[PDB]
Short mmCIF file of C-alpha atoms and ligand atoms in Angstrom, two decimals:
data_model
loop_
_atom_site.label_atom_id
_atom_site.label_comp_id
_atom_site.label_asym_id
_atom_site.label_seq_id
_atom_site.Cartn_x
_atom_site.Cartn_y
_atom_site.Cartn_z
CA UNK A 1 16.62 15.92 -6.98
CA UNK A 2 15.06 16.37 -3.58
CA UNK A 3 12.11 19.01 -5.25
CA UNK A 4 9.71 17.73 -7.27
CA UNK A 5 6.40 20.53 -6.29
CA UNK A 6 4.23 20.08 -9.57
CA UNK A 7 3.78 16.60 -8.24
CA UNK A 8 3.61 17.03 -4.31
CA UNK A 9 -0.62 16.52 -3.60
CA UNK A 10 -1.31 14.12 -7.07
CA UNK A 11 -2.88 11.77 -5.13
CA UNK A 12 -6.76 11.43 -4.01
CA UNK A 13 -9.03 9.09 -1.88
CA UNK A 14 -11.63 7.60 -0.06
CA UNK A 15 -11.17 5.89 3.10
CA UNK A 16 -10.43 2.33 2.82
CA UNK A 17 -10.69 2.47 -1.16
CA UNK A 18 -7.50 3.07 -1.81
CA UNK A 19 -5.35 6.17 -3.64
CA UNK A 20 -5.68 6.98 -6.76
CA UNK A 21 -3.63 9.40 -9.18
CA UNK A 22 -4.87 10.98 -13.06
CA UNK A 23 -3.25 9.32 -15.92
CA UNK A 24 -4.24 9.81 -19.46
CA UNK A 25 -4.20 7.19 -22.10
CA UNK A 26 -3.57 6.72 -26.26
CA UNK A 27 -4.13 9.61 -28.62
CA UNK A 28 -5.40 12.26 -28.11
CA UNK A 29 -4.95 11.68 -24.46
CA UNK A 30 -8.09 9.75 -22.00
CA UNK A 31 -7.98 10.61 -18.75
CA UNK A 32 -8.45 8.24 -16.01
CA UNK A 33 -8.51 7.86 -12.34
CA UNK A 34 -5.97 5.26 -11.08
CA UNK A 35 -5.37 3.41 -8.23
CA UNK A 36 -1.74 3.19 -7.16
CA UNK A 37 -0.68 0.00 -6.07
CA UNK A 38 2.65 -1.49 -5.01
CA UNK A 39 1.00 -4.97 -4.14
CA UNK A 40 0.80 -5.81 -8.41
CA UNK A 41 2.11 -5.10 -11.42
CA UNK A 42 -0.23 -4.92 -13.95
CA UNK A 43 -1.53 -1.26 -15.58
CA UNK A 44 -4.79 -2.89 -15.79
CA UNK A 45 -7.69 -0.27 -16.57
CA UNK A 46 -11.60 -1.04 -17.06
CA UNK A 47 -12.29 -0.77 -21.17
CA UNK A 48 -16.57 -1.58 -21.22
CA UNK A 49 -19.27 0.63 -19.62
CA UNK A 50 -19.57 -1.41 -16.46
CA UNK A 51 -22.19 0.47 -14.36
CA UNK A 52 -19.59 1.11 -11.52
CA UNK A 53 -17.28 3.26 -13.50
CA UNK A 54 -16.92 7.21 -13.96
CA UNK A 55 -15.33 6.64 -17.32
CA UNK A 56 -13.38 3.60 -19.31
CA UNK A 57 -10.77 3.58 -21.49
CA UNK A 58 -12.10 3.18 -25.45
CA UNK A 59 -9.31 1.67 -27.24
CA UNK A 60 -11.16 2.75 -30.63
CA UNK A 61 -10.75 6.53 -30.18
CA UNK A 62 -6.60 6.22 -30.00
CA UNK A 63 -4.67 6.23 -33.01
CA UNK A 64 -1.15 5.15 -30.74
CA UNK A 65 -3.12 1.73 -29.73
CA UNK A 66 -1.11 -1.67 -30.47
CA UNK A 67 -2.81 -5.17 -29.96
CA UNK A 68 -1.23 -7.86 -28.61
CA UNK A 69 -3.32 -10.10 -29.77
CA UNK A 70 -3.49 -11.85 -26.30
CA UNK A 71 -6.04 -12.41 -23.64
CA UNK A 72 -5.67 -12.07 -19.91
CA UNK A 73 -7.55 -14.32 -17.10
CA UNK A 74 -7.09 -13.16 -13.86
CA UNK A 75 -9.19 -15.07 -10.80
CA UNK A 76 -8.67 -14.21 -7.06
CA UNK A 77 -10.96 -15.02 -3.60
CA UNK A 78 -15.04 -14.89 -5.06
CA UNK A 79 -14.04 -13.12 -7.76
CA UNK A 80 -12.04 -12.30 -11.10
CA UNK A 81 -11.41 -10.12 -13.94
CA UNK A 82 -10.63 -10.53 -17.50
CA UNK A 83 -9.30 -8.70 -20.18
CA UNK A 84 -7.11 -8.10 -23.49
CA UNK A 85 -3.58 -6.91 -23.87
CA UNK A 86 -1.67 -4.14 -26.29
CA UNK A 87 0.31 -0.96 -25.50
CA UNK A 88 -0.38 2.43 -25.80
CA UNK A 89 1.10 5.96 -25.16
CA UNK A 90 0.76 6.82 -21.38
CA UNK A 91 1.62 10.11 -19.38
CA UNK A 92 0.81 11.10 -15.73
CA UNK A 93 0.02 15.24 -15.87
CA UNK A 94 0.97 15.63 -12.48
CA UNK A 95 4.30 13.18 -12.60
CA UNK A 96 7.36 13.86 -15.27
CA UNK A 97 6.97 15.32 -18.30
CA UNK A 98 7.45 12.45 -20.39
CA UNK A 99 5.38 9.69 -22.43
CA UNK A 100 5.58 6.44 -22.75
CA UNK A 101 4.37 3.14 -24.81
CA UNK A 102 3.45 0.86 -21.86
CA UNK A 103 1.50 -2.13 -21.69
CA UNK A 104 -2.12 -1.87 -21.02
CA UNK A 105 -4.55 -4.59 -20.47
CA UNK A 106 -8.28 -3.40 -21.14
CA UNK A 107 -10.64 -4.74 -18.73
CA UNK A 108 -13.84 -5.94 -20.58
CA UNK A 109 -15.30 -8.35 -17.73
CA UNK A 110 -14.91 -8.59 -13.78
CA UNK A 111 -16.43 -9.29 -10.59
CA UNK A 112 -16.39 -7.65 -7.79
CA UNK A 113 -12.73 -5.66 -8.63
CA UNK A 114 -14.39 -2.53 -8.85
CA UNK A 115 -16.11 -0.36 -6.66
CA UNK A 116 -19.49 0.64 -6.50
CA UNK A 117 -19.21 4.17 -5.67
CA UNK A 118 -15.39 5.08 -6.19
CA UNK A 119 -13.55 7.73 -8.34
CA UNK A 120 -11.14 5.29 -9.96
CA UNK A 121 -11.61 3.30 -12.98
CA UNK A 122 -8.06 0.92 -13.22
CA UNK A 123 -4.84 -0.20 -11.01
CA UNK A 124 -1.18 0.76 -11.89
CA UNK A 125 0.64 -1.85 -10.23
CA UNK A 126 4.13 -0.81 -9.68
CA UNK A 127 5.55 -4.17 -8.22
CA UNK A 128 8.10 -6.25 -9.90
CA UNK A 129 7.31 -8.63 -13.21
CA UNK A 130 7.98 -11.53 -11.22
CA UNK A 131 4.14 -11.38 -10.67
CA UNK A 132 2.77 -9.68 -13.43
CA UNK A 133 -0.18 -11.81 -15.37
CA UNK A 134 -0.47 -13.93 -17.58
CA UNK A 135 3.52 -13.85 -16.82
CA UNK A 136 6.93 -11.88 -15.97
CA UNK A 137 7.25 -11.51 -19.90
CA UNK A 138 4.60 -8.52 -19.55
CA UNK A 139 6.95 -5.40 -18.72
CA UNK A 140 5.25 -3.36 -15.78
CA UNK A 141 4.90 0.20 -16.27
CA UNK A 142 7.59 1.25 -14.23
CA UNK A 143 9.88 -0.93 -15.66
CA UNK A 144 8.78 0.86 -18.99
CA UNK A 145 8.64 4.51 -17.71
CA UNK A 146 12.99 3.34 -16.92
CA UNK A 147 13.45 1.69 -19.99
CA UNK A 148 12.45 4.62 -22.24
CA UNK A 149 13.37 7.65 -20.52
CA UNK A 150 15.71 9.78 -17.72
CA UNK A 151 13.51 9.16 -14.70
CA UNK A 152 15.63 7.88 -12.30
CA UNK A 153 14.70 4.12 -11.42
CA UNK A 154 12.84 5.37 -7.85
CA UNK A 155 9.33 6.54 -6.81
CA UNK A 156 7.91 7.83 -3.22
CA UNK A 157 4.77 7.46 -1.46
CA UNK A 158 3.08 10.24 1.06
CA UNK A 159 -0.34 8.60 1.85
CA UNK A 160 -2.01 11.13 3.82
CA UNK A 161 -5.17 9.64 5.83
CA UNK A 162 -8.15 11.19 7.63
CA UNK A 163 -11.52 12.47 1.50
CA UNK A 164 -7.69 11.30 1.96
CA UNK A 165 -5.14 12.85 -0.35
CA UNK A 166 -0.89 11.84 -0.60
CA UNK A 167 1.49 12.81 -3.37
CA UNK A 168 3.49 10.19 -5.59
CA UNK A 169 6.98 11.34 -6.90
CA UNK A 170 8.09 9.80 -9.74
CA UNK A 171 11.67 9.47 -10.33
CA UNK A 172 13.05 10.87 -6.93
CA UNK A 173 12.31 12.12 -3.05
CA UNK A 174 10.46 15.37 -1.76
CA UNK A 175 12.29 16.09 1.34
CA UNK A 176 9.57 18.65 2.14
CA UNK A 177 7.38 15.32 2.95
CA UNK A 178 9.54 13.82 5.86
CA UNK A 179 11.02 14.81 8.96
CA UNK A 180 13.78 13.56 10.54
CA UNK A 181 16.09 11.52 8.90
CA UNK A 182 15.34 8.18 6.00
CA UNK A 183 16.04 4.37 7.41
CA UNK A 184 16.68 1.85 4.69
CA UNK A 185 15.22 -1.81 4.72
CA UNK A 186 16.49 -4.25 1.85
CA UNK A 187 14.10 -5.23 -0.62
CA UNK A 188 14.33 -9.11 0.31
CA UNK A 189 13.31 -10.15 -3.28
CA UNK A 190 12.28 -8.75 -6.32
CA UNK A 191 8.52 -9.96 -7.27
CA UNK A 192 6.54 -8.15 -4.19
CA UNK A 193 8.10 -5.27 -2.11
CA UNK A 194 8.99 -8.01 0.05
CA UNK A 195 10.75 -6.93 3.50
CA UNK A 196 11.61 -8.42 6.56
CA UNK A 197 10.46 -7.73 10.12
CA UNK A 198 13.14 -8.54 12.96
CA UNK A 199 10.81 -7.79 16.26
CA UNK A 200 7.48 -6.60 16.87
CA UNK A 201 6.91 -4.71 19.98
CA UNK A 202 3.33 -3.06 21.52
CA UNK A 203 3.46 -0.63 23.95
CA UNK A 204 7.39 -1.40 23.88
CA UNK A 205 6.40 -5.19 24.98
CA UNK A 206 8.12 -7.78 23.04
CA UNK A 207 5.62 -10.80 21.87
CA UNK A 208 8.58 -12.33 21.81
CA UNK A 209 7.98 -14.51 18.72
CA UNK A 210 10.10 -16.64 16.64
CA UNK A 211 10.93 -14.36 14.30
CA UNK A 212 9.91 -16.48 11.27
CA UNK A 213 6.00 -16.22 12.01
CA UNK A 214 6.74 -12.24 11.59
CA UNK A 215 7.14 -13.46 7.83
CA UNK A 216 5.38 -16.04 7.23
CA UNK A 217 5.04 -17.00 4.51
CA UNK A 218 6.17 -13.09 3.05
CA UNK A 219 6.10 -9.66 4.42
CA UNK A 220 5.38 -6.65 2.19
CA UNK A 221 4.58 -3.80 1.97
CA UNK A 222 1.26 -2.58 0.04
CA UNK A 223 -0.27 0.64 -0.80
CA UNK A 224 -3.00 -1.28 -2.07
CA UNK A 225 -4.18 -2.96 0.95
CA UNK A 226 -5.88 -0.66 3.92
CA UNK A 227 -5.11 -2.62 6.62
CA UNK A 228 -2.01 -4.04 8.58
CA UNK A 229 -2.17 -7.46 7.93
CA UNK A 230 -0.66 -10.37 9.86
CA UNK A 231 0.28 -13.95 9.70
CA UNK A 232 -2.57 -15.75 11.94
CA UNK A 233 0.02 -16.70 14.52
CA UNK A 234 0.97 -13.18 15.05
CA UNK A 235 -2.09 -11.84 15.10
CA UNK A 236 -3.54 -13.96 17.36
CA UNK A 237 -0.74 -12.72 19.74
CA UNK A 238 -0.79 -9.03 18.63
CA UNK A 239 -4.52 -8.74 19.49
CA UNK A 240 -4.07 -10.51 22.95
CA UNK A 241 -1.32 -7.79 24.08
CA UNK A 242 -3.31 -5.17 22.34
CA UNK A 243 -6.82 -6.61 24.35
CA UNK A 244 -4.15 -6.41 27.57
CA UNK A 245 -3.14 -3.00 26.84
CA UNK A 246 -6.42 -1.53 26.80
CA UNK A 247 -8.17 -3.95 28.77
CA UNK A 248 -9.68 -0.23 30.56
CA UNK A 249 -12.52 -0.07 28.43
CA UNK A 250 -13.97 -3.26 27.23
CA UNK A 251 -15.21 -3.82 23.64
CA UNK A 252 -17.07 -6.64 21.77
CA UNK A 253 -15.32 -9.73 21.12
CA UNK A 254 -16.53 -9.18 17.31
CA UNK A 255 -14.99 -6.00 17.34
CA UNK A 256 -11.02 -7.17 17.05
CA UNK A 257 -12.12 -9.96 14.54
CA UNK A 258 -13.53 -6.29 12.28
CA UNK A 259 -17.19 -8.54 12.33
CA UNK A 260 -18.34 -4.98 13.97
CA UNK A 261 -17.41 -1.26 14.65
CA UNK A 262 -16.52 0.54 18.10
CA UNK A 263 -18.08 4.19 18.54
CA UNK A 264 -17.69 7.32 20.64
CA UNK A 265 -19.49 10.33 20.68
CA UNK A 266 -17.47 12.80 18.57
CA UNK A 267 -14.33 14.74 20.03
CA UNK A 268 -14.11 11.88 22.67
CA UNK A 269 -12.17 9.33 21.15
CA UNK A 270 -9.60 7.86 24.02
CA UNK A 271 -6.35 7.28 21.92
CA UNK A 272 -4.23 6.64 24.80
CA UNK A 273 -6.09 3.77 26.11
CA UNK A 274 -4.36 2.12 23.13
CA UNK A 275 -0.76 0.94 22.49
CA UNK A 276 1.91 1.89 20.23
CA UNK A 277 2.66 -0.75 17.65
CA UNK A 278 6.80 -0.99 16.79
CA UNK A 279 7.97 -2.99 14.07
CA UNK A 280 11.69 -3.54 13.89
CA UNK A 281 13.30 -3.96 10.46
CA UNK A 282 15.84 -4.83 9.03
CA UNK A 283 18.69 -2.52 8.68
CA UNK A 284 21.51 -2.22 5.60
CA UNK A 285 23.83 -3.45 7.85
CA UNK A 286 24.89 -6.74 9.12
CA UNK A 287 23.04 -6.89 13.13
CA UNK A 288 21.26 -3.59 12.31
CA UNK A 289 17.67 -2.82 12.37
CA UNK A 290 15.38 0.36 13.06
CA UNK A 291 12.14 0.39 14.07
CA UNK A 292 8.93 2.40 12.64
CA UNK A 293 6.13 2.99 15.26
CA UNK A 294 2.42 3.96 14.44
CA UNK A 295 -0.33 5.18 16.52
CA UNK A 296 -4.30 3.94 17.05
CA UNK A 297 -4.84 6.95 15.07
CA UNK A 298 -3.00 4.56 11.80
CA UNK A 299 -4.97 1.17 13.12
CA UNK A 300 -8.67 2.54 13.93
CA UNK A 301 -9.99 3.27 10.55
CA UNK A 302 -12.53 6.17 10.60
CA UNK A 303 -15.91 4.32 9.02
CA UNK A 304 -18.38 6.86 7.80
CA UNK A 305 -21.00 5.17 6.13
CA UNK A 306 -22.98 4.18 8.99
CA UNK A 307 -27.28 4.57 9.09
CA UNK A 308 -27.24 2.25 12.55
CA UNK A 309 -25.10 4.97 14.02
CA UNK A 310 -24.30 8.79 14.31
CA UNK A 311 -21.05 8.79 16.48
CA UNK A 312 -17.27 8.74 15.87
CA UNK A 313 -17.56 4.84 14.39
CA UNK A 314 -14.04 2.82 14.03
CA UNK A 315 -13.23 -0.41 12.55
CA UNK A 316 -10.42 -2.47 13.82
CA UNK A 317 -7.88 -2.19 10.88
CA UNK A 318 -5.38 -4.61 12.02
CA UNK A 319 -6.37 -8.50 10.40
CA UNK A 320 -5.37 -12.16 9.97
CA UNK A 321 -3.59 -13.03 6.80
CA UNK A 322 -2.76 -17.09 4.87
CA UNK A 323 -0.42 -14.63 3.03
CA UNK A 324 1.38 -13.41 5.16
CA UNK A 325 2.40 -9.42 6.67
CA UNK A 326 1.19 -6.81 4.65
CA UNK A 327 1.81 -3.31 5.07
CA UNK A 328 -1.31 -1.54 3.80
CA UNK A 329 -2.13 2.01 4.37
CA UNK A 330 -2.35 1.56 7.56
CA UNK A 331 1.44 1.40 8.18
CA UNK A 332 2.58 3.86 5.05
CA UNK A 333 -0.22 6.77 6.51
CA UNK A 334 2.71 7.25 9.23
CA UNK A 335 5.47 7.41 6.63
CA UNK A 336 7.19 8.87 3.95
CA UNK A 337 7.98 5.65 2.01
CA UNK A 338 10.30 5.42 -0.56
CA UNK A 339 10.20 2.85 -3.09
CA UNK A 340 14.61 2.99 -4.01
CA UNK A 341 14.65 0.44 -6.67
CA UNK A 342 18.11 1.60 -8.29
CA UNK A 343 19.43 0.07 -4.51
CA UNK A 344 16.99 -2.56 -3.79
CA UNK A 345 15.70 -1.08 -0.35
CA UNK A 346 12.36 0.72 0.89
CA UNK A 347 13.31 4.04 2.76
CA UNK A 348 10.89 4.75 5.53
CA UNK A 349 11.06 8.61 7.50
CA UNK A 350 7.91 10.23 9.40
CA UNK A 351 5.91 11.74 7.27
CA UNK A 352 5.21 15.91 7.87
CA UNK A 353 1.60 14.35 7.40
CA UNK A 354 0.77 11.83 9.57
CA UNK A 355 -2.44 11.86 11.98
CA UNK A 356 -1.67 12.40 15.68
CA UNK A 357 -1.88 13.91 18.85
CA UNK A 358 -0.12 16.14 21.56
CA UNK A 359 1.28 13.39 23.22
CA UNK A 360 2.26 10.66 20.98
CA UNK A 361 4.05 10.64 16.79
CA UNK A 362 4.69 8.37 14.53
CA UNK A 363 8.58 7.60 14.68
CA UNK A 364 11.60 6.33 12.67
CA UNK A 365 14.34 4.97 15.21
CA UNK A 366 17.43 3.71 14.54
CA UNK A 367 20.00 1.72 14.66
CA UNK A 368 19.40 -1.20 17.18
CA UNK A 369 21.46 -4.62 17.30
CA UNK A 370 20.06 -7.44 16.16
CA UNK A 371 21.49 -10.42 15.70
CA UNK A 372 20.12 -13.54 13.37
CA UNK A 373 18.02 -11.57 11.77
CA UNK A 374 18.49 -13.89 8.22
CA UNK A 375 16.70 -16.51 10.20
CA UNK A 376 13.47 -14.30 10.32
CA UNK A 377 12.94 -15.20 6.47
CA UNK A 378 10.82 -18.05 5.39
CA UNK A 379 11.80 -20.37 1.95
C1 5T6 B 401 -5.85 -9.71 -8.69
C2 5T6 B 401 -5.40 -8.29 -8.45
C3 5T6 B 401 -5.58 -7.72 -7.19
C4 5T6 B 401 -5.17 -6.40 -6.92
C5 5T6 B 401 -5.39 -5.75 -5.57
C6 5T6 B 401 -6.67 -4.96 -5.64
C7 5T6 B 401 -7.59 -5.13 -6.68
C8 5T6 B 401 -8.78 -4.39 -6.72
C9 5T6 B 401 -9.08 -3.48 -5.70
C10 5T6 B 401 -8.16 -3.30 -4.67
C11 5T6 B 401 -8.44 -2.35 -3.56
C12 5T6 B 401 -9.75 -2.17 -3.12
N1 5T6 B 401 -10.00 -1.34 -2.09
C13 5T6 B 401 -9.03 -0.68 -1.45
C14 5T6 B 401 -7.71 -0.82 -1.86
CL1 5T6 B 401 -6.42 0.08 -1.00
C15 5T6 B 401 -7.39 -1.67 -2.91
C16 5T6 B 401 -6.98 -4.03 -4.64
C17 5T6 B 401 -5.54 -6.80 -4.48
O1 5T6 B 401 -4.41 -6.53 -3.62
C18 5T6 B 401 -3.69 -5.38 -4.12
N2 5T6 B 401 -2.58 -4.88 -3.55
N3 5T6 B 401 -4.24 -4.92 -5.16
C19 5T6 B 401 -4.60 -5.67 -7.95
C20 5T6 B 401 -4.42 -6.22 -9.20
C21 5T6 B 401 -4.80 -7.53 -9.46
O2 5T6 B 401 -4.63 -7.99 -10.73
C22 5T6 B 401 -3.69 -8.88 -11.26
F1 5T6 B 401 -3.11 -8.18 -12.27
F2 5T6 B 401 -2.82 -9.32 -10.29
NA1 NA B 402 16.32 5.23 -18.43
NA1 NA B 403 12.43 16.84 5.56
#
């Protein structure tokens, strides 16, 4: 409890492509790059020489593989990704020392899932079964990992931004990673890490919102997403009081839609031109919330890969959403996050790693009264 070192800095990225950590795979052991995701809950890894892909996982070569005989259609927005299901024997070398027979599908046909150019080859999603495909029936990993050994039914998340890097302990808490003291959010429901924002404040300005349109039609919260994402509704009025705030330098309309990037020359980035953003939570107790703040430093997303340019170049990485709030990496990059399924609540505290400056942190406040905060939820 409370030390876990062999696993503090598993975790490795690129900006706005996620974080990934090694697993290995059947027997003898394949290792693979794998992107950690707590927006799905499939351990779904690519299993065909797509050009894309460092490596794949080649079911023939392990004498542990099971088939399950069963195929796996998966379709989202312009896209989709097939495969077919078993179980094999699964370890993470820089997690517990344990192994386990989880459920694997083997991706043999997709569009645009992977990416051209990344170091990760599949997705561990360690949400709830309630969303797992073809259907809840198909145990998660995590739920395996419990199942079969000791490791205590919790896992921890220090995203790190900016090549990013984080660390993922499995089974417990690293109090090394946080300062200050843990606040505890209930886990509304148990298919998404589904949460529920109280108030949202910028610059300490309420926007003074039914609460309901904070969660509509979910809120959650999603290492696998980069940006923050909110309900249109919300956004709509989160940009207009962010546009206010900073209203001392003008930028393209374009730019707060994320249809184009903002630049400076280097070293002159002006960070205080822009607004905290404060979203209150809600607390363990009855009429109790707390409040997590980030900086422009979590919502402008250092871009890189630009030939038009040669400056400091930042996209907008706050966005519109028809599915509601999602916590990407834009929120968890200011926080320690922990994942406390044993209790059914998400622990947030600032995290020792955060991006900042002199004058302004990331910050985990508590406990404020709020009242009717059960209204805030949408059915
Ligand atoms: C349909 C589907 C979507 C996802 C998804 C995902 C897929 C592929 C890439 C990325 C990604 C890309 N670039 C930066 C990042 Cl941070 C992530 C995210 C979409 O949303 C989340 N949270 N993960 C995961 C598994 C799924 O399979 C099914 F089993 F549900
Ligand atoms: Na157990
Ligand atoms: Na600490």
């Amino acid at each position: 409890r409370g030390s876990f070192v062999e696993m503090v800095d598993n975790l490795r990225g690129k900006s706005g492509q996620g974080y990934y950590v090694e697993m290995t795979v059947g027997s003898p052991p394949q290792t693979l790059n794998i992107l950690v995701d707590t927006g799905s809950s499939n351990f779904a890894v690519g299993a065909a020489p797509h050009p894309f892909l460092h490596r794949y996982y080649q079911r023939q070569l392990s004498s542990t593989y099971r088939d399950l005989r069963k195929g796996v259609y998966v379709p989202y927005t312009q896209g989709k990704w097939e495969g077919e299901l078993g179980t094999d024997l699964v370890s993470i070398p820089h997690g517990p020392n344990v192994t386990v027979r989880a459920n694997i599908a083997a991706i043999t046909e997709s569009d645009k899932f992977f990416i051209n150019g990344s170091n990760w080859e599949g997705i561990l999603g360690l949400a709830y079964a309630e969303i797992a495909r073809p259907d809840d029936s198909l145990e998660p990993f995590f739920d395996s990992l419990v199942k079969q050994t000791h490791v205590p039914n919790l896992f921890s998340l220090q995203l790190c931004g900016a090549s990013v890097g984080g660390s993922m302990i499995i089974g417990g808490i690293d109090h090394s990673l946080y300062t200050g003291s843990l606040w505890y959010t209930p886990i509304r429901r148990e298919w998404y890490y589904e949460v529920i924002i109280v108030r949202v404040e910028i610059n300490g300005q309420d926007l003074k919102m039914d609460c309901k349109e904070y969660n509509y039609d979910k809120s959650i919260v999603d290492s696998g997403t980069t940006n923050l994402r909110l309900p249109k509704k919300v956004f709509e009025a989160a940009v207009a009081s962010i546009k206010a705030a900073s209203s001392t330098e003008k930028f393209p309309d374009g730019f707060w839609l994320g249809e184009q990037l903002v630049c400076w020359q280097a070293g002159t980035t002006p960070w205080n031109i822009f607004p905290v953003i404060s979203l209150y939570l809600m607390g363990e107790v009855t009429n109790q919330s707390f409040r997590i703040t980030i900086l422009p430093q979590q919502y402008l997303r250092p871009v890189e890969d630009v030939a038009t340019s040669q400056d400091d170049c930042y996209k907008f990485a706050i966005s519109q959403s028809s599915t509601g709030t999602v916590m990407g990496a834009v929120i968890m990059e200011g926080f320690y996050v922990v994942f406390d399924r044993a209790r059914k609540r998400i622990g947030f505290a600032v995290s020792a790693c955060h991006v900042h400056d002199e004058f302004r942190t990331a910050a985990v406040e508590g406990p404020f009264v709020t009242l009717d905060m059960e209204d805030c939820g949408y059915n």
